[PDB]
């Protein structure tokens, strides 16, 4: 929507950079690169100069990396880049359906994924996030998040050649591969870390190394604890270096020093090199953590956005086809900044996890009341229209209860009481809770509790199967379809989590595996059950069948509804029935009113709001029938979801 | 607020009535009557002329009834008339507290009531409604509502001399007697009905008597059934006369013909005679029913208000001390007319039962949600400021669920489903209902059901005492105190129903009185338990003493809170917590915010409401303490009531 | 609508007052007095006790004064007393039209006034304010406002016998005499001042006397100047007593000491004695000024209202027929207090001058814009419903431009530039001004300027006659009729100013009388022209006839419009045409919308406003025709006035 114009004082730097490009590239090729370089230079420079002392000199070192990566980029990928520059809203379209899986859990190896494309296609998948598949450190590696070599696929998954062959097969089916960029920290066994341990100065400066506790003890006073059960605080003593090292996550995940321009250059090179193997989407893992400042929580620092802007411009110049997706699991008031605000407006990640939306679905499912969800989403600031939320019900991580005290108070709830209730409820402790979840990283000092468990176990299917009640089994599947209905119809890329289309339960296997046993997040990282996939498809009356055919129907309707284009945002309706979540999407062809019963009971909704939103003859795209109106009310079945147009 | 000026065209009529008055009365006495007649003749004429064809002739016959009743009015009652003309807002005062009781159940006899005046004064009672105590017909007489002689006390209660001696005792303790005026119908054993049964045309015209089914069949097409279990439809064949007679209620209750000027003169005479016995308040029983019109439900007809205006003016001229209370148990949309609208503004009954407030209190208790209550009460039109509601939680009658579809639809409820639910809940059939009530007058043609039962039995105390559950016993007592706090705090004369101050339960002994056995309203008309009264005063921790002391505490705070002056009306607040009913009363000394928790669970309320209503240092008059504010919220205990001023 | 109950602690005091009353009165007479004492004692006491130190003993001395005034009260006035208690909204009725005149200017003598009651009754007058007619000091007496003897009529006007006979004739024809109560100050030639000047210590305590400048100099630091051209500051040295005396107004008007209980008693006695000669309304002259407090402006002090409450209760007890009218020419935020606020709610004067409305009428006529008027009147607080405004276009005084900076700023005006423009405009200095007015009391230190002139001279008739333009003469008459229509239609007692019904011009006679020549307010205090009165009656096409017949028609239409009852207030509409002033008055019989075109050109108003106020068939009571609606607009003639009902 806004292009950053070329400031006069940077005309001379552009001249120097085009001359340097002139020595690598010729003809129409040099011209294509040169026009893109000119377009994005303003954002690339504004990013680097906020952070690194010699931006002009850093840009001179960056040029040949842009150039070599341009030279190395395939005809097929250059064609996708050009195709995406002409249709820049591609990722915002209703046809975008995503699927998230660990390769070894989904299909064994990268090559194995080729033979399950037919299954991804049947769910209309156009986006596939394979969980970290680059070479990690041995034993415990936080499910691939402790990276030992960014340039190598984990041995048991295959080779870079197999990745290239996989991306070629996904592109031929219109499927975009998403890959983690674990740019906050490396495994202590990574070459950069190994070289830092041996006292190599260049590589000491890639890390936050302290000779004693004086600085770490000061840092700790304002630092939270991400994994207090695994590695208390944020520092680890390293025997070999005799130095204290910043370790936000596990103690073998070593935070990189993003003040060092040498680190920026490593990742600019790494992004373009993975782009060239066929990575179309980079998930910026732990993006909020990348800048350290004494006296702060070392999260959401302004420099995070300056760095992200420079990395995004690198990708804009050489690989137009690629997106960034921010992992920013932050407070409702902090999230919007990761899609770019003020001087960064729309110059940052294309997408970001809507953690607030995911939290409010589960909260509303537990309370049967949507007032907090309605208020928190109504207060959410508008995003740049060139960006998209990633919507989800579950993922590979535990649920953090990101509820703002201000939103709870606005609707007569205590923030602290409700956050506590959500872990009481989803851990199965609250009286008559349907949930079988596990407390994760209970902090006795802050009171913070997170929740682990599969959608299906949290939504009541585990309990219904134990208790043998057919009605509670039905309600449980209805809750899952309702929650998926919200993620499919809010607007954004819907991130289906592997096996939720089969209602997979909690997998307690991890307890018998000593490298996983301490980390109960593995309870919701099951192996795929292909026998269950075959039974769901063959028998639509089975639980897995009800979930599979129900979700497949919502996907088919969502992609056939232009009103779900993510450039348009949900305008939250006043919850006139406090059990029914509602919003309208204002498309050029007309309005869509979404209603969602967060209750197991029949609920009535004032029919006049359909007419108020211009819908004289309301038609529900999910049922494919007129919405029945009786005595000025819409009658909603238990957990009904309605996508209503004229 | 508005005096009706005398039209130029009635000056001649006024002069004739004055020259007729000069024949009965002499000096200062003639002047007093004569100024009063002047003042109210305009309302009296405009009421009669709308109903009766020869209004100037009827006025000439009424004049010697006015003058005789003036002459027969004691010096004490004349003193009270003058004091009330000087303070017309007396019945609107917070000090006004009412008690309702059947003489035989409360104190055996009218003489008996004299010995219980100390008990009433203990509860701050300044208004006593003794249930119909005039001579009824024998056997079943609908608890006194089938009157055989309006000029005789029922024999077992004493005589008219006892009534005079009791009202003298009540006046000396500032207590006003409320007596029923059963003006819609008489016992078939009444002189009028016996003269009609013998074929006296004059007395047949006191009723609605038809020679065959021709007119009855047409009337019935638009008539509802008040007592379908007692007397189907609205007509009874009388064998002696050969005539079908209009009987809205029981077969032996005969609807009077209000098109007959003679019936009007009978009741104008009867009102002033009873006022002169010391009746201070007339309850207009079945006032909505007194005009019949073919093709209507024969309720709420315009002539009802013309007649009421004329009868009211009669009392204003001769007995300024007396008030009228309208019994109009009608739809929300119809109730406001009984305090006078349009040409009848403030000229009708001084008070009317707020059946909508009563219904909404029980509805909100069953559902734990106050949205319907808040919307129905918000939409309620403003009343003339010279009038007051009578507030109440229970009374001698069943509960009729007067819920308007329009109010239900606005807050996302089906009026039909919700009305059906309230009888399901309070009959005890709904899963986990705390209530022990009975279905009354279940109509299979309309689906209508009403509920009988004591406050204590409907509110869960019966169930709690039977299971020996201490938590449910506590919660049931709190629900009764919450309910009473709303009737005490809304603005209006609070009608305490006899024994509810002791949490009296359902009395099933009516099942063995064959004259009561068919009418289960007797389940909530117990004999007073003076053993329990003594135990309640002695033991503040007994169930009966919790109620007794809890209720006297609320009464003492009400009486010392000028904000409860009924000339001011509750301004309903948005139920920002849907479990918490809230309103402000805007007094000259400042605002009072009333908050009521309708949930057995702790509820938080946005503190900013208090400051938005100008309450900088919020003080709860019930607790005698500052309202605790924590994290911008008020923490309410289960069934908490707060009366908050600065 | 609120009767203040007797606190328990005052019950002993009531018994002593009743016992003292039993020595002076007997029988039914004593009962009547006793009930009125009981009813108003609580207000009387609460007023005295906030001001005087021994309230209990002051009441014992007041009692015999009350008792004596009661015994002196004639049967005719007692009858009126009892008539007004029955109809206490009497003065709020549409039929109340007021007339204000100097006796000598209107009819020569009190006797002469009897001969002009035909004229008053032809204008529908029910309220006659005769300007100060009690014995003044000689020569300059501020037009009767320096009083030498409260107990004598000014000799040239007749005697107390003439006043008594005049009020009898006025009562016979339903007219209420308004008399000034100049309670702030007496002439220096008054007996109390004469006794003070010869060193009698009891009468020194009736004034604010100082031995030297010590205290006066400190008082002056926070005091404004009312008459800076006549008597700088607020003090005068008295050569006889050798003392500085407080003189707010002229040097020979000596401010009474209202801290002295004897001053209270003098006025309690005077009010009842005047009332017994037939005064029905007391104008509390300069009521704002009666309390002094160092470091305040000695206006609007809380003791003013307590003293007023006490004097009002006195009149309630002994003369129910009398009204108090407050002269409070104060700022917009201060006026409402004179109708009773907080603990004084509706216990003070019955009426007060609406100086803000008068100011806003002239402001709007000058600017052709009603937005300042619409905003100022919208923000005005609601009066108690037992009270009424007095509305007026002109009076015996200069115009003070009472405009709040906050109101002006809300509609994009500088408060100070707009007050300057009003004096620039009405002084005739502003370009194209139609006004012939004079600057009064121009204060160089402060910038304050007031304006003298007749309605017709301010409104442009004088300029129009000089220019001989028949179209400007027309617009001048239209402005006067528009202004009068607002005072007749707003709600309240309209104070017609003697001669305004004939469009009388500035009278420059006063410059020939040395006693008047320094005081240019005499410019708008003309002698009545009775030849002009007859010409206006006989020639409706004359300027005086167009005004007389135009005004008589508005009066006749107001009288027969129940919607103008003053218990109801104007609800100000958005001025959606900024030249057209609008409000609705919400009567029980339906809404009235009043539209007033403050422009000399045709103006269009959106017709949807009328349907929005419930008028499907808009009828204009002034034209006696349907309101023409064309293209969703109401077409308003220059200076058009519409009083619109269904």
**SS3 call for C147:** strand
> Which secondary-structure segment (H or E) carries B162?
helix B160-172
| CA-to-CA separations, A482 to A98, B166, C142, in angstroms, rounded | 18, 69, 85
Q: What letter does residue A126 receive in the DSSP assignment?
A: -
- Nearest partner of B600 among B422, B424, B477, B466, judged by Cα: B477
* Structure token digits, residue B121: 């004064």
* Structure token digits, residue C212: 């030297």
* Structure token digits, residue A169: 């097969």
What count of other Cβ atoms lies within 10 Å of the Cβ of residue B495?
25
* Structure token digits, residue A379: 């207060």
Our CA angle for C305, C307, C313, nearest 5°, is 100
- Nearest partner of C338 among C313, C297, C308, C360, judged by Cα: C308
In A, minimum Cα distance to B369 occurs at: A578
CA dihedral sign of residues A159, A165, A171, A173: negative
* Exposure letters B77-90 (e unless 16+ CB within 10 A, then b): bbebbbebbbbebb
CB of A99 closer than 8 Å to CB of A146: no
| CA-to-CA separations, B36 to B27, B33, B313, C515, in angstroms, rounded | 15, 5, 10, 52
Q: Do the chains contact at B631 and A416, CB–CB below 8 Å?
A: yes
Distance CA B108, CA A213 (A): 89
Q: Do the chains contact at B31 and C342, CB–CB below 8 Å?
A: no
Largest CA-CA distance found in chain A, in angstroms, rounded: 79
**SS3 call for A239:** coil
C512: exposed, middle or buried (Cβ count in 10 Å: 0-12, 13-18, 19+) = exposed
* Structure token digits, residue C139: 């020569």
Distance CA A539, CA A533 (A): 10
Contacts of B86 in chain C (CB under 8 A): 3, 35-36, 39, 85
Q: Do the chains contact at B631 and A417, CB–CB below 8 Å?
A: no
**SS3 call for B359:** helix
Distance CA B470, CA B460 (A): 12
Contacts of B2 in chain C (CB under 8 A): 89, 565, 567, 588
Contacts of B589 in chain C (CB under 8 A): 342-343
Distance CA A490, CA A558 (A): 10
| CA-to-CA separations, C389 to B308, C324, C344, C482, C489, in angstroms, rounded | 34, 12, 17, 19, 12
Question: Assign residue B142 a region: left if phi > 0, alpha if psi is -120 to 50, beta otherwise?
Answer: left
What count of other Cβ atoms lies within 10 Å of the Cβ of residue C101?
22
DSSP letters of C45-71?
HHHHHTT-S-HHHHHHHHHHHHHHHHH
* Structure token digits, residue A188: 């202590």
Contacts of A633 in chain B (CB under 8 A): 409, 412, 414
- Nearest partner of B616 among B607, B603, B606, B624, judged by Cα: B607
Question: Looking at the DSSP assignment, which residues form a beta bridge with residue C101?
Answer: C130
DSSP letters of A200-238?
-HHHHTTB-EESSSHHHHHHHTT---S-TTTS-SSEEEE
Side-chain half-sphere exposure of B553, counting CA atoms within 13 A: 17
- Nearest CB among A412, A415, A576 relative to B605 is that of A412
Distance CA C207, CA C223 (A): 18
Our CA angle for C278, C281, C282, nearest 5°, is 105
Our CA angle for A416, A421, A427, nearest 5°, is 135
The beta strand positions in A24-145, using DSSP E, are: 98-101, 127-130, 134-136
* Structure token digits, residue B320: 């300024």
Phi, psi (5° rounding) for residue C606? -60, 120
Q: Beta strand pairing status for B209-210 and B619-620?
A: unpaired
Q: Do the chains contact at A412 and B603, CB–CB below 8 Å?
A: yes
What lies within 8 Å, CB to CB, of B118 at 6+ separation is none
A458: exposed, middle or buried (Cβ count in 10 Å: 0-12, 13-18, 19+) = buried
- Nearest partner of A580 among A531, A629, A633, judged by Cα: A633
Q: Do the chains contact at A412 and B580, CB–CB below 8 Å?
A: yes
Long-range CB contacts (< 8 A, 24+ apart) of A220-223? Answer: A222/A295, A222/A296, A222/A297, A222/A298, A223/A297, A223/A298
Distance CA A347, CA A2 (A): 9
Question: Looking at the DSSP assignment, which residues form a beta bridge with residue B605?
Answer: B634
Largest CA-CA distance found in chain B, in angstroms, rounded: 79
- Nearest partner of A309 among A50, A128, A553, judged by Cα: A50
Distance CA C554, CA A548 (A): 80
Distance CA A199, CA A178 (A): 36
Q: Supply the Cα-derived Rg of chain B in whole angstroms.
A: 25
Our CA angle for A145, A151, A156, nearest 5°, is 65
CB of C589 closer than 8 Å to CB of C641: no
Helix axes A302-318, A55-72, angle to 10 degrees: 40
What lies within 8 Å, CB to CB, of C474 at 6+ separation is none
What chains are in contact with B, requiring at least 3 Cβ pairs below 8 Å?
Answer: A, C
Long-range CB contacts (< 8 A, 24+ apart) of B360-364? Answer: B361/B393, B361/B483, B361/B486, B361/B487, B362/B399, B362/B422, B362/B426, B362/B458, B362/B483, B363/B401, B363/B403, B363/B418, B363/B422, B364/B581, B364/B598
The beta strand positions in B303-343, using DSSP E, are: 323-326
B52: exposed, middle or buried (Cβ count in 10 Å: 0-12, 13-18, 19+) = buried
Our CA angle for A519, A524, A528, nearest 5°, is 125
Options C255, C327, C398, C507, the catalytic residue: C327
Contacts of B28 in chain C (CB under 8 A): 28
Phi, psi (5° rounding) for residue C402? -75, 85
Helices (H), A96-156: 103-106, 110-114, 117-122
In B, minimum Cα distance to C4 occurs at: B87
Distance CA C292, CA C281 (A): 26
Helices (H), C380-497: 405-410, 415-426, 455-458, 461-467, 470-489
Phi, psi (5° rounding) for residue B244? -80, 130
> Which secondary-structure segment (H or E) carries B451?
strand B450-452
Q: Do the chains contact at A604 and B414, CB–CB below 8 Å?
A: yes
Q: Beta strand pairing status for A493-497 and A388-391?
A: parallel
* Structure token digits, residue A47: 């990013």
**SS3 call for C630:** strand
- Nearest CB among B369, B578, B604 relative to A414 is that of B604
- As a 3-state breakdown, chain A gives helix, strand, coil percent values, each rounded to 5, of 45, 15, 40
Distance CA C99, CA C128 (A): 5
In B, minimum Cα distance to A574 occurs at: B411
- Nearest CB among B412, B416, B606 relative to A606 is that of B412
What's the distance, CA B12 to chain centroid? Answer: 39
Distance CA C282, CA C288 (A): 15
Distance CA C479, CA C459 (A): 6
A366: exposed, middle or buried (Cβ count in 10 Å: 0-12, 13-18, 19+) = buried
Phi, psi (5° rounding) for residue C147? -100, 130
The experimental method is: X-ray
> Which secondary-structure segment (H or E) carries B152?
strand B147-153
- As a 3-state breakdown, chain C gives helix, strand, coil percent values, each rounded to 5, of 45, 15, 40
Contacts of C87 in chain B (CB under 8 A): 3, 39
* Structure token digits, residue B351: 């008070």
- Nearest partner of B485 among B578, B573, B572, B557, judged by Cα: B557
Distance CA C481, CA C473 (A): 13
Size of interface B-C (CB pairs under 8 A): 74
What count of other Cβ atoms lies within 10 Å of the Cβ of residue A53?
10
* Exposure letters C456-489 (e unless 16+ CB within 10 A, then b): bbbbbbbbbbeeeeeebbbbbbbbbbbbbbbbbb
CB of B324 closer than 8 Å to CB of B315: yes
> Which secondary-structure segment (H or E) carries C268?
helix C261-276
Q: Do the chains contact at C1 and B86, CB–CB below 8 Å?
A: no
CB of A472 closer than 8 Å to CB of A368: no
Question: Which of B124, B588, B645 to mutate against chain C (most C CBs within 10 Å)?
Answer: B588
| CA-to-CA separations, A121 to A98, A170, A481, B18, B233, in angstroms, rounded | 11, 10, 20, 100, 69
What chains are in contact with C, requiring at least 3 Cβ pairs below 8 Å?
Answer: B
End-to-end CA distance of chain C: 31
- As a 3-state breakdown, chain B gives helix, strand, coil percent values, each rounded to 5, of 45, 15, 40
| CA-to-CA separations, A371 to A133, A478, A576, A598, B399, in angstroms, rounded | 41, 21, 9, 11, 32
What count of other Cβ atoms lies within 10 Å of the Cβ of residue C77?
20
What is the 3-state secondary structure of A442-472? Answer: CCCCCCCCEEECCHHHHCCHHHHHHHCCHHH
Distance CA B485, CA B508 (A): 28
**SS3 call for B90:** helix
What lies within 8 Å, CB to CB, of B372 at 6+ separation is B360, B363, B364, B403, B407, B408, B411, B413, B418
In B, minimum Cα distance to A370 occurs at: B578
What count of other Cβ atoms lies within 10 Å of the Cβ of residue C627?
20
- Nearest CB among C2, C28, C36 relative to B565 is that of C2
* Structure token digits, residue B149: 């002689």
Distance CA B143, CA B395 (A): 13
Phi, psi (5° rounding) for residue B156? -70, -10
């Amino acid at each position: 929507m806004f292009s950053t114009p070329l400031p006069a004082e940077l005309r001379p730097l552009l001249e120097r950079l085009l001359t340097l490009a002139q020595d690598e590239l010729s003809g129409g090729d040099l011209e294509t690169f040169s026009l893109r370089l000119e377009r994005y230079l303003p954002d690339l420079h504004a990013g680097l100069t906020a952070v690194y002392p010699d931006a002009e000199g850093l840009l001179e070192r960056l040029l040949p990396i842009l150039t070599a990566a341009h030279q190395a980029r395939s005809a097929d990928l250059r064609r996708l880049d050009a195709k995406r520059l002409l249709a820049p809203d591609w990722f915002q379209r209703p046809e975008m359906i995503a699927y998230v899986a660990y390769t070894e859990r989904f299909a064994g190896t990268l090559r194995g994924v080729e033979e399950r494309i037919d299954y991804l296609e049947e769910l209309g998948v156009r986006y596939l996030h394979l969980m970290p598949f680059l070479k990690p450190r041995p034993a415990p590696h936080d499910g691939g998040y402790a990276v030992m070599d960014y340039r190598a696929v984990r041995e048991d998954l295959g080779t870079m050649a197999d990745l290239e062959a996989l991306t070629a097969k996904l592109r031929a089916r219109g499927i975009a591969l998403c890959c983690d960029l674990v740019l906050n920290h490396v495994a202590q066994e990574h070459e950069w870390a190994l070289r830092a341990r041996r006292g190599e100065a260049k590589y000491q400066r890639y890390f936050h190394m302290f000779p004693d506790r004086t600085l770490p003890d000061e840092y700790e006073k304002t630092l939270p604890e991400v994994f207090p059960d695994f590695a208390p605080g944020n520092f680890t003593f390293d025997e070999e270096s005799g130095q204290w090292v910043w370790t936000t996550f596990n103690r073998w995940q070593w935070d990189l020093n993003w003040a060092n321009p040498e680190v920026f250059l490593e990742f600019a090179d790494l992004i373009l090199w993975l782009a060239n193997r066929g990575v179309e989407v980079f998930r910026l893992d732990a993006i909020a953590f990348i800048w350290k400042r004494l006296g702060t929580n070392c999260q959401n620092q302004p420099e995070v956005h300056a760095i992200t802007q420079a990395l995004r411009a690198v990708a804009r110049i050489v690989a137009p086809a690629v997106l960034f997706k921010a992992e920013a699991i932050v407070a409702p008031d902090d999230l919007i900044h990761y899609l770019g605000q003020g001087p960064h407006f729309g110059l940052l990640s294309d997408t970001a996890y809507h953690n607030s939306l995911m939290v409010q679905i589960w909260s509303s499912l537990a309370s049967r009341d949507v007032r907090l969800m309605s208020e928190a989403l109504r207060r959410f600031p508008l995003k740049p229209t060139n960006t998209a939320w990633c919507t989800y019900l579950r993922c590979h991580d535990d649920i953090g209860w990101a509820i703002a005290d201000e939103d709870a108070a606005r609707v007569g709830l205590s923030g602290e009481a409700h956050r506590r209730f959500l872990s009481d409820y989803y851990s199965g402790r609250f009286p008559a809770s349907f949930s079988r979840g596990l407390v994760f990283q209970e902090n006795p000092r802050t009171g913070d509790r997170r929740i682990s468990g599969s959608a299906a176990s949290l939504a009541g299917l585990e309990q219904a199967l134990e208790r043998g009640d057919p009605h509670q089994l039905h309600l449980s599947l209805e809750r899952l379809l309702l929650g998926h209905a919200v993620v499919l119809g809010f607007g954004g890329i819907p991130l289906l989590y592997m096996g939720d289309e089969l209602a997979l339960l909690n997998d307690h296997s991890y307890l018998e595996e000593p490298e996983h046993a301490e980390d109960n997040r593995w309870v919701h990282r099951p192996h795929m059950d292909w026998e269950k996939a075959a039974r769901a498809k063959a028998d639509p009356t089975s639980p897995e069948g009800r979930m599979y055919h129900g979700l497949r129907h919502l996907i088919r309707v969502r992609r056939t509804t232009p009103h779900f284009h993510a450039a348009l945002e949900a305008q939250i309706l006043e919850p006139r029935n406090p059990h029914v979540f509602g919003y309208v999407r204002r498309h050029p062809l007309g309005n869509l009113v979404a209603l969602y019963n967060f209750s197991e009971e029949v609920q009535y909704y004032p029919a006049e709001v359909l007419w108020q939103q211009g819908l004289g003859l309301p038609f529900d795209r999910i049922s494919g029938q007129l919405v029945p109106i009786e005595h000025h009310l819409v009658r909603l079945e238990p957990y009904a979801r309605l996508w209503i147009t004229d």
